[PDB]
Design a protein around this ligand. Structure first.
Ligand SMILES: [Mg+2]
Length: 273
């Protein structure tokens, strides 16, 4: 509904900066799906495709990423069933990264030399929010260390930006030994939201929320919010469009089909801040 949408936004404008927080995922939501007719990497793709991984390992990774993607997007498997294979996927991929023994100290370059790209209008996005100290919660199934390097180098890792994702654990050689915490993956963001109660309880007054996502999973990122009064959900539908469009229309407040900018969120922010 166009009217239900403006009712929500008017709630937002009314509350201003004092009541606003942002929740958002990273991959394909702050970062582009494609650019100049070529696909852009996900955090995981950044690592797969870099010079610190052998030809043979990347072949094993693609062999994986083909088998397990096929299962993720299976129309007949219920998500109940997909869950273990998603778990299985990440475990093997990370296992293959681990053996490669990647240096903590070499991330800076790797990100620098990838084709990673942020949606149009990100400076304006991140700079407006910092200027009004609007809490930003970035919740990602990707790789925290790379995510973080993408936004630091883009010059937008502001003090209001809390990043929560799958973070790497290293040994005393500054060389990868695995991953901290319980795994975040596409199907369990709810479980992850509730685990971040400390964060949200400090924002008891920030009761106006804009959620940004690009998957059906992303819809659950708000489940740990203390006070909800008004909430707007923006969905970036980049792929599997004809399959999922009626679904997105039915759950996100705004669907943006293959929209590689942040202009819609910026214009809403324009009206609020
Ligand atoms: Mg995503």
């Amino acid at each position: 509904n166009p009217t239900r949408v403006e009712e929500i936004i008017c709630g937002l404008i009314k509350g201003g900066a004092a009541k606003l927080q942002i929740i958002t995922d990273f991959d394909m939501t702050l970062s582009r799906f494609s650019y100049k007719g070529k696909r852009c990497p996900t955090c995981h793709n950044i690592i797969d495709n870099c010079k610190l991984v052998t030809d043979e390992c990347r072949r094993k990774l693609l062999q994986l990423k083909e088998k397990y993607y096929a299962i993720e997007v299976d129309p007949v498997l219920t998500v109940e069933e997909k869950y273990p294979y998603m778990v299985e996927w990440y475990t093997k991929s990370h296992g293959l990264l681990v053996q490669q023994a990647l240096p903590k100290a070499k991330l800076k370059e790797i990100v620098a030399e990838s084709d990673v790209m942020l949606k149009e209008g990100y400076e304006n996005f991140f700079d407006k929010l910092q200027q009004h100290s609007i809490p930003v919660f970035i919740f990602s199934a990707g790789i925290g260390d790379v995510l973080e390097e993408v936004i630091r180098q883009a010059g937008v890792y502001h003090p209001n930006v809390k990043v929560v994702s799958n973070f790497m654990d290293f040994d005393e050689t500054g060389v990868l030994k695995g991953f901290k915490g319980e795994l975040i993956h596409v199907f369990n963001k709810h479980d992850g939201a509730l685990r971040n109660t400390e964060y949200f309880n400090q924002l008891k007054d920030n009761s106006n929320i804009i959620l940004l996502g690009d998957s059906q999973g992303d819809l659950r990122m708000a489940d740990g919010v203390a006070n909800v009064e008004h909430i707007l959900k923006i969905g970036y539908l980049n792929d599997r469009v004809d399959e999922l469009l009626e679904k997105y229309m039915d759950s996100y407040d705004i669907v943006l089909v293959q929209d590689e900018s942040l202009e819609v969120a910026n214009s809403i922010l324009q009206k609020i801040l």
